[PDB]
Amino acid sequence: YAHTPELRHMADGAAMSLSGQRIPLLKPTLSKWSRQLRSDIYDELLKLPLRYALHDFRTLQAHIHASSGLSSASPDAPAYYAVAGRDSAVGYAPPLGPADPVDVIPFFVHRSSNGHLPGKVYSMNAKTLMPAFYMRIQNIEGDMFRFEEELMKIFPTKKIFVRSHSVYVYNVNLDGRAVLHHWLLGLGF
RNA sequence: AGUUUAAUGUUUAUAAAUUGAUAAUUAAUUUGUUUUAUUUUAAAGUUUUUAUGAACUGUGAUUUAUAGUUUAUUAUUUUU
């Protein structure tokens, strides 16, 4: 379909600067600070065979009455008193707890002192600036081995290792970081 | 006796860039309670700063004739 001479606009994210309106239609946008979520990533997690039924993408949204409805920060009816931790245009929201009230998840991930999730993408031999990255899930707790297994059903072909404190997943760029959170979000953590 | 490039990145916690400039901002998106000190061994021509050296070998200045001999010559040809 070269008859449409437009579509040049869909181009790349490699060899060319990517920013603003031109952000790749596959590349997620979940950063450390803007916890943006995506429905594409969430279906991969919802169409995969796993235990621990994730949370419905309906009851997972932190973002989609005096003067015809007021914001979700509990701005009160007087359109005056409002409450501190109730609305967040950056995507922040506390955990929702596991979705199955009959199951005991064997691992508990612990958000950090700033409300993050334990996955951080490092580089192998950063001295030479080698573009070979892995992950590390530092705040795991519980039966972290039965946490390793669930990562296999998501990442079947990634060399996954486990120590007492962390869980390394190798060859996982900034994208496999996002895909990890949507799991730990939907998981109720 | 005898020769040195730290094989490790766990909870307070936060590290993006860009103009020749003013400046401008979807500058996409990491890492680090801040990680710094190290870089063989032996080994020539050489340089440099001060120093010393005439008991050696170098050139002054005070010794004014303890030896045999040739030619008249005080010069000598010698002696040596």
d(CA A137, CA A107): 12
Distance A42 CA to B40 C1' (A): 58
Which nucleotide has its C1' atom closest to residue A122's CA? B31
The CA–CA distances, whole Å, from A177 to A91, A122, A135, A172 equal 16, 11, 7, 7
The CA–CA distances, whole Å, from A64 to A2, A57, A73, A79, A119 equal 37, 11, 14, 21, 26
User: What interhelical angle do A174-186 and A39-46 show, nearest 10?
Assistant: 70
Amino acid, res. A48: L
d(CA A67, CA A17): 44
* Contact (Cβ atoms closer than 8 angstroms) between residue A70 and residue A79: yes
A23: left (phi over 0), alpha (psi -120 to 50) or beta: beta
**Of A124, A120, A114, the residue nearest A140 (C-alpha):** A120
Distance A42 CA to B8 C1' (A): 37
d(CA A121, CA A135): 4
DSSP A172: -
* Contact (Cβ atoms closer than 8 angstroms) between residue A90 and residue A33: yes
Q: Which approach determined this entry?
A: cryo-EM
Give the experimental resolution in Å.
3.4
DSSP A86: G
- Nucleic strand B near CB of residue A113 (< 7 Å): yes
DSSP A85: G
| Nucleic strand B contacts from chain A, 157-176, CB < 7 Å | 164-166, 174
User: What interhelical angle do A144-154 and A174-186 show, nearest 10?
Assistant: 120
d(CA A134, CA A77): 49
